[model samples]
Target: EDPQLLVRVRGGQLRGIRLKAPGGPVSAFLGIPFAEPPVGSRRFMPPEPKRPWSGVLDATTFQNVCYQYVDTLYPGFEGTEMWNPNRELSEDCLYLNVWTPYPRPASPTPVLIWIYGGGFYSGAASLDVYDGRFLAQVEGAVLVSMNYRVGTFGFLALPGSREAPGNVGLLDQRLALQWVQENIAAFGGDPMSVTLFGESAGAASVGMHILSLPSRSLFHRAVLQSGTPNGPWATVSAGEARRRATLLARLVGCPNDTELIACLRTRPAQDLVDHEWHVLPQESIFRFSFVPVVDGDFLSDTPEALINTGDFQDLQVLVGVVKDEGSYFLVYGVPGFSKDNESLISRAQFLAGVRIGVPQASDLAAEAVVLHYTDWLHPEDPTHLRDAMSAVVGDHNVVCPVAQLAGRLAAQGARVYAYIFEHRASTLTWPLWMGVPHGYEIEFIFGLPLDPSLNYTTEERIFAQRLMKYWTNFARTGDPNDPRDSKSPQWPPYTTAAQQYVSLNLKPLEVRRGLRAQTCAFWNRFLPKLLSAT
Candidate 1:
């Protein structure tokens, strides 16, 4: 240990950095390296343990963000960022940050580790929106976040390449958790009580950590918001991986390079972004975002194939998808019509899609989404002939999978708490009205009411507090039930009987038991059984 007071962490050591809240109390932390820079020769390989330092280094300044235009990549992400003078594709992306409400020497508190989402493409924990001050002070839990390689730098795999394991971002996440397991106590957090939770892509990552082997014993509780366990990137089949590799090659110029890894790693960043990028761009490019792949070796099984057969059936799970899960998908899918009736399709056609023509399959999908989703809309208006195209597709892509995951896990005896954020913003277009659209609940969960589209008020703050209690308490104990001092009703586990779910809507909270299971079965069973065969 250095003569000066120093804090130590797994793989390395550094001094604590102070966190200053604007006009509010500040937080501090030790910004030490957790993994060796995966640059030069180390690129494409698993993260190596970070080397330790002797003297105490100042942890005041937050580390530079990974190489990328934070504003350009994410919407509303245009303001201030600690511009990393370094390039965006640095292999040295394995860094984590901690925010404690009170950094004074005190007893350990429960830990809530956050994983930012961008479909495994472009998000860092350093975003101002993810500021830990709200989570740490309002929720009274230790907050931790980190950076992992995204896009080609993180998930690229070559033909017959045994040297690199796919899911490098996943690997970095595991190491970050492992670091917490060994060293969070120094920062006033209980490693054993750590709860891993994330939104969208981050939520998917949390699901991966839950399913992974090395990460099995790392976290005690999990919360997945607006994310699921299915789909191509997170859980893909072997054949898809091979097909994807060819697709990736077709996009990247170097088709037959003997040193594929070197050629791709050093490729121009713009080239990587244009063609080879598995990442989704901010202009609503979600589906094509570089996602987690189902490599046969590293990721042998898909979440669905394993839900019924895998051994990770006993861990506690709190899973939820937003109401109108696919509205975002639709709005992006059909760019011309940002508003409902404004669609290029006629009202008769839109209404036809809304009622029957759309359910099985409709050309204008958005109208159909609003049709089914409008069944429970607030500030109800007959004028809103909601489109179901994106909702149906998004449901098929991510929502149903989440319900299936909860249903399957419940069947296996794991304690599960499920929820649906059915809250919709009325002012925006039908694009904004599909109940609790994707990533809408993130600000409420983290207690960061900073989303531009969401104009939260004093009442919303109370609602945010209520949401935080359910999450943090669930993280501490496997149970999401907070009978004592909570605004929402008691949340029950989803055993096979009634697949119970807690709905955070404008009305009284709904505990519609077995409702989630039915939704999944309705979609998965009918789509594949009734539709796929067609």
Candidate 2:
């Protein structure tokens, strides 16, 4: 630990560590507490602000990650193992990490806060893929990531009970944002120029903050990647949250009386997290068991209702998804589909997969999905059937939701930029047919190429560099392209009429229009009416 890496904040002075980077030295302050431990009686309650410490806090080491179960389906698989928490698990895990350039700039720089995605059930700031050293030192920005409660510990909502309100995980994020607002300036970060960005569930968290009136003044820009607040799997109704919570209580031997919340507080953290799978239905294996609900507080109404009324903040928005967003789920999250059996899906399997992917849809709605996605030319071909199934999962869960979000935000007069990450990295071991699956853009956005230890090819390294510049440029200014760095094409602001967006690829970036337009129209416009009529 170096004394030059010390910084004073509202909580107290902290000593950080400096790491050598390609551009320069970057200072990292790890595991800085922003909230009081949500343990014992405080379990499932909104996080309390962390009090100031007496002396200089040693923030060089990462602390405990929020309690969550390790992935059991594909144990030791690189894709899943890379995301597992690298630290101990505990209830006292409300901490945030900060990365800034050493020898602080004369003026405060733009701040980029990251929220990790593990379907909202698992994720940690200490994950190796999220290391902010390269992005902060090379891209010239201050990066921050926070660890919040996940699974049952963070989202157990009991209606009418003050003990366990829904969305404590989001509340934890809100508190961390407030902490940034109060102390980021001391670390040479412009709090007012903050951009909240994340992938998948983390992106959905950013969307929730965008729609939250209380969170409006905290962030000025937002980036949603492969997930949206309005995504069918992103949120559930209050009744659904209650039902899951009640069922979880029963699974853990807690009574169903008024003491449910109290009894839940007494259960072991691992016990509660372990039982999350029991709450999920067979048809809904792709969905998370515990997620944000339309509580009267944080979110007063549904995301669709809020967007329809134009009740969200009008800020610069950058949203997009990978070309094969659902392929990841098909190979990992879904039950029948496997990476080894990529071309084995049959017509019968495709119909069943549609039903399993969207259990909430009516029988007619499911049939319509099957009819719309079927490949007429090769209807019986197993490879075509698998591709069709992937499209069904992608369109409903990620692609269509993202397209709808960009268009709606643009229509509401917010400056929005959209992109589809079409570049499949050489490092991916999955089948090429998987395309650029979910969360594939993360390593590039975080500047994995800058790390000398990684085996990224020359072309892949250059692509990663360009991607980082686009991301950090957006953090600096609302626009993704900067005149100072003209390697990439100028990304135009997305509009309702043009609906233009950059197709991010290894080849020269191309500005395309109407991303999955016809398919999005089906999901956003036609499907809702179909469901309502049923």
Candidate 3:
């Protein structure tokens, strides 16, 4: 456990990181800068290469997350309770963290480079949970996580900003992948074995990568948890990105003015970010001024369209959504919508309209969601209002779209793996029985620290162990078929005819025969003409 390698970068100090790894000596180089900070004249453009430095550089101390609003970071900063984290914003935040088991696994450990999910707005690689040590040391992986721009800073598409446009966050992700391809071998990993995985916004971003012409050589395997390729929530056209940014500007106080475009960029990052609080409240369940956009140059079309038409190459893909996808949103919207059915649909349409979609179906979708996730409702006979909302919103928002994407890919003759995480979620707070609420699988995959806040029973830990192995196996090979120690059966890949699925239930793994077709058949029959006609 020590500093096994050393290198220099730009105008930085000289030193290396030391760490104790499981089963071997572990060394990790943390905060390795991938792109020059996009500040000053370089703001909103493509990443710039580093200026070579002269000595061994210290890879200790993680960097600050890129420019995000203070309200989201520094709450309770002023006299009132705002949503701010009070985080310091730095345009110079293109750093990445890498962990490798030392004495270097000669055969090159499977590399898993993580892209943190923040709704394309908030999350960063600096979140402690994303640390690579446990994944690297115990699971025998070369783990990596990185920082990327977010908020108005990352995707603001002003006239000058149009050079790179809205997907700078995703482009940064691609850049970091490129960095790994070049340097992972030096860190005790095979440069060739890399898996790019993410959740929610991160998963959706990987959806873009699947559509990216530039990402083909970057990685061969991907794991997209809690997100799927669907027309509504996928990438947008640059013109549409422009329209969205224009709307965001109106929200952020750069209201229609002479210098709104140029003036907005120079405004202090905090000033613009804090305004997002008023624009997209934390209580807003569906979307804030976040989520990926399609710049005509980069993401010319939605990832669903790309994958559906086989416009993109077929790579080994693993995709899944939780059983109760809406419950997490329910945390905010539920208390409001729980009273009656109409109140629920009103809320769903409001949120869907904000994200740019139809509201008529929004009500039906919300109802469907509640039906599938009605366990959230108490059983005292309350008209099952929760069940109805879950039925309507869940389908419109997640379930149907997820199944549709898998079906489309399967139809394309790709090796598609799909799963529905059904374990009554074990989280850091509120033991959610609402069927694996959003982002629940992440802590399990990472074997997250057990907080009295996030309770994990002994059985939960075992479930975590098995899932982590399966995830890593999926990354190493194309399929998540690693049945550890003969305890499980042969898990088959999801296909078109059978539409087979693997369900991550409470106990042993179960193969869901025709579960996909049985449940999603309605959407299956509908999505092709819907997406194509659009």
- What is candidate 3's lDDT per residue for 70-185, written digit by digit as tens? 43222333211212222355878888888766545677778998887755667667665575666776677888888888776776664335343556777788888888887777
Best by lDDT, which number? 2
Return the TM-score for each candidate structure.
Answer: 0.82, 0.97, 0.82
Alpha-carbon lDDT of model 3: 0.63
* Residue-wise C-alpha lDDT for candidate 2, range 1-534, written one tens digit per residue: 465689999978998998788878988899999998998989889999998898889899998999987877677678678888899999899999999988775698999999999998999999878989988888778999999899988888986578888899999999999999999998899988999999999999999999898898899999998999997888888888998999999999988435998999898888887788888755564599989988978998898887767833457999999889888787655556876655567888888888888878888999999889988888778888888888888889998888888878888878899999988877886777788888888998999877777988888888888888888888888888877864646789888899899988788879999989999999999999887877
Q: Candidate 3 at 373: error in angstroms?
A: 10
Worst 10 residues of 3 by lDDT: 77-86
Stretches of model 2 off by over 4 angstroms after superposition: 256-258, 311-314, 333-336, 485-488
Error of 1 at 21 (Å): 5.2
By lDDT, is 1 or 2 better? Answer: 2
Q: What value of lDDT does candidate 2 attain over all alpha carbons?
A: 0.87
Model 1: residues with Cα > 4 Å off, grouped in runs: 1-6, 10-13, 20-26, 67-91, 255-258, 277-286, 312-314, 339-344, 347-386, 424-435, 450-455, 483-488, 506-508, 514-519, 530-534
Which pairs clash (backbone N, Cα, C closer than 3 Å) in model 2? none
Task: List the global CA lDDT of all models.
Answer: 0.63, 0.87, 0.63
